[PDB]
Amino acid sequence: LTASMLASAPPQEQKQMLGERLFPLIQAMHPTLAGKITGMLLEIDNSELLHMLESPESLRSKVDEAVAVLQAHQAKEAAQK
């Protein structure tokens, strides 16, 4: 995936393009929550999403962050809701 291929497509479809490259990696880390985490991350700068696709420590760091918030939220909706 190149930045050129990305400008070639429109917004909505650029995330789809990026998600395809991101999914397999995020999946390896979390097979079950993969879909969701990916979805959550796709609302970030493509320029930075492009960076994460080249930096594992960065991708992982972002993934763990998403995992934490995701669980804290759900747990919240559990105690009260």
Partner: peptide, 13 residues
Amino acid sequence: RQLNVNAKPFVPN
């Protein structure tokens, strides 16, 4: 660094 927990899940293709 702010994330949306209600973001629509992505699906492979």
